[PDB]
């Protein structure tokens, strides 16, 4: 029947002082077509592109998306890499050059065999008003807010099929 | 050849004001055995368990891990859920009850065919000292910091085999 609260807490250790400056900086997803991914994350979800890195020998690019004010992004390049990579809660999109032209190619979202990664999730002030807008924009849904057993929580998908949870923190208690 | 900077930026839109309070709240990974996972993320990586939710008819639990001070966690149950689910940069582990006792079951890390998800990543003050400690604690490595081409960057594995990048934002520019 799973762990009890107390049993779970018994498995948790206090943070060693050597970890006290650590932060959860990024979640990396591979994307077939960065043009479509950038449009989605910025126009649909309101993220900002904060950094782009290109590796021509390895034939890939990295795009770092975050909820940050574009006016805070440093102008000077070294400062800009160090700032972008010290922001909490970034999304790192990895583009292996040439996938966008390969009709047979797609990435796997983790929610079918083989399962592992599930989703990123965005906390919004109002899941219903968010989802109405997503519907107006033609966003793909896995689960509408009222569909299924978990009313008031939604799942959409990005251009690659990755699932994104849309959740309201302030309603999850009174729900 | 991958996108030019100009081409990438032209795919980006400004944040619609409907999205102005959105935040990247969680990354969700499925875990075989929450006992080992809680021990890893708290003892090894210095995260705090901030919330745990159980669903006894659906037979799964959710564990929310973050770099937060345990003294900040609200005492009142409903306030704690609202606080936990409005923290940026949480890691949500999902445990389907029973997997820990099924020797034919395991999750996929996304880095072998079919690929998709890559890794989460932790920013640290000192990759090499962090990794020396990891080695002392018997952590499994995908890439030690001096291995391979990108010297000074590491990848460890959690108990499920998910990859965790260990990076120092200040050393990433100069390299
Ligand atoms: C998993 O993500 C969530 C969920 C749960 C939603 C799920 O997608 C889910 C994952 C595994 C499973 O076996 C059943 C359902 C519920 C509340 C919440 O806040 C949250 O973030
Ligand atoms: C994909 O994540 C990155 C990379 C990108 C990838 C790698 O450097 C890499 C090296 C060895 C390996 O086994 C797997 C991947 C480079 C810089 C950076 O900051 C970052 O976050
Ligand atoms: N809370 C559920 C909701 C997801 C859902 O409704 N699942 C279906 C709806 S599209 C799905 O993933 N595919 C199987 C189906 O169509 O029955 C979750 O864990 O994501
Ligand atoms: Zn990375
Ligand atoms: Zn979730």
Find chain A residues with C-beta within 8 A of B77's C-beta. 173
Residue whose CA is at the smallest distance from ligand 1 atom 18? A167
Name which of B120, B114, B95, B115 is nearest B105 in CA terms. Answer: B95
Question: How many domains, in total, are found in chain B?
Answer: 1
Q: Do A24 and B59 touch (CB under 8 A)?
A: no
Q: Which ranges constitute the DSSP H helices of chain A? A: 5-10, 34-39, 77-84, 127-136, 169-172
Across the beta sheet with A60-66, the strand order is A48-55, A60-66, A90-96, A23-30, B117-123, B163-167, B154-157, B140-143
Residue with tokens 């050059």: A97
Q: Which ranges constitute the DSSP H helices of A2-118? A: 5-10, 34-39, 77-84
Which 3 state secondary structure label does DSSP give B46?
Answer: coil
Which 3 state secondary structure label does DSSP give B34?
Answer: helix
Which 3 state secondary structure label does DSSP give A24?
Answer: strand
Sign of CA dihedral B13, B18, B21, B22: negative
Rounded to the nearest angstrom, the gap between the alpha carbon of residue B4 and the centroid of all alpha carbons in its chain is 30
Chain B residues 21-40 within an 8 A CB cutoff of chain A: 21-30, 34-35, 38-39
Find chain A residues with C-beta within 8 A of B61's C-beta. 2-3
Q: Using CA atoms, how far apart are residues B120 and A27, in angstroms rounded to an integer?
A: 4
Neighbours of A103 (CB within 10 A): 5
Name which of A116, A148, A166 is nearest B18 in CA terms. Answer: A166
| Structure-derived torsion over alpha carbons of residues B132, B138, B142, B143, reported in degrees to the nearest 10 | 20
Residue with tokens 């890499």: A81
Q: What is the CA radius of gyration of chain B?
A: 19
DSSP A21: T
Structure tokens at A88: 């909490």
> Quick check: CB of A148 below 6 Å from ligand 3?
yes
Q: Using CA atoms, how far apart are residues A117 and B108, in angstroms rounded to an integer?
A: 8
| Structure-derived torsion over alpha carbons of residues B97, B103, B104, B105, reported in degrees to the nearest 10 | 40
Q: Using CA atoms, how far apart are residues B55 and A81, in angstroms rounded to an integer?
A: 42
The torsion angles phi and psi of A3, rounded to 5 degrees, stand at -85, 145
Rounded to the nearest angstrom, the gap between the alpha carbon of residue A147 and the centroid of all alpha carbons in its chain is 22
Q: Are A155 and A142 in contact (CB under 8 A)?
A: yes
Which method resolved this structure? X-ray
Name which of B60, B111, B121 is nearest B89 in CA terms. Answer: B121
Q: Using CA atoms, how far apart are residues A123 and B24, in angstroms rounded to an integer?
A: 7
Q: Using CA atoms, how far apart are residues B142 and B162, in angstroms rounded to an integer?
A: 10
Q: Which of A110, A128, A162, A166 to mutate to test the interface with B (most CBs of B within 10 A)?
A: A110
Q: Which of B39, B41, B117, B165 to mutate to test the interface with A (most CBs of A within 10 A)?
A: B117
Examine the residue annotation and report whether A165 is marked as an active-site residue of this protein.
yes
Structure tokens at A86: 């010290």
Rounded to the nearest angstrom, the gap between the alpha carbon of residue B131 and the centroid of all alpha carbons in its chain is 17
Structure tokens at B52: 């745990």
Structure tokens at A127: 């899941």
Structure tokens at B91: 């890691």
Q: Do B97 and A2 touch (CB under 8 A)?
A: yes
Q: What is the CA radius of gyration of chain A?
A: 19
| Structure-derived torsion over alpha carbons of residues B113, B117, B118, B124, reported in degrees to the nearest 10 | -160
Residue with tokens 């000074």: B152
Q: Which residues of A110-148 are buried (b: 16+ CB within 10 A; e: fewer)?
A: bbeeebbbbbbbbbbeebbebbeebeeeebeebbbbeee
Q: Which domain holds residue A16?
A: 1-175
Sign of CA dihedral A95, B159, B170, A26: positive
State the pairing for strand pair A163-167/A117-123: parallel
Name which of A61, A66, A56 is nearest A27 in CA terms. Answer: A66
Q: Are A93 and A40 in contact (CB under 8 A)?
A: no
The torsion angles phi and psi of A159, rounded to 5 degrees, stand at -60, -25
The torsion angles phi and psi of B141, rounded to 5 degrees, stand at -110, 140
Which 3 state secondary structure label does DSSP give B81?
Answer: helix
Q: How far is CA B85 from CA A20, A54, A156, B35, B78, in A?
A: 22, 34, 18, 22, 11
Q: Does B71 touch chain A (CB under 8 A)?
A: no
């Amino acid at each position: 029947g799973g762990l009890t609260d107390e049993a779970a807490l018994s498995c948790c250790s206090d943070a060693d002082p050597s970890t006290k400056d650590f932060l959860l900086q990024q979640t990396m997803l591979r994307v077939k077509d960065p043009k479509k991914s950038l449009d989605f994350y910025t126009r649909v979800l309101g993220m900002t592109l904060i950094q782009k890195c290109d590796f021509p020998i390895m034939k890939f690019s990295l795009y770092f998306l975050a909820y940050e004010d574009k006016n805070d992004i440093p102008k000077e390049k070294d400062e800009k890499i160090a700032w972008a990579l010290s922001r909490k809660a970034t999304l790192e999109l990895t583009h292996n050059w040439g996938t966008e032209d390969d009709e047979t190619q797609s990435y796997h979202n983790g929610n079918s065999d083989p399962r592992g990664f599930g989703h990123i999730g965005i906390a919004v002030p109002d899941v219903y008003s968010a989802c109405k807008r997503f519907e107006e924009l033609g966003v793909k849904f896995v689960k509408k807010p009222d569909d299924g057993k978990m009313k008031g929580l939604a799942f959409i998908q990005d251009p690659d099929g990755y699932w994104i949870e849309i959740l309201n923190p302030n309603k999850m208690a009174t729900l």
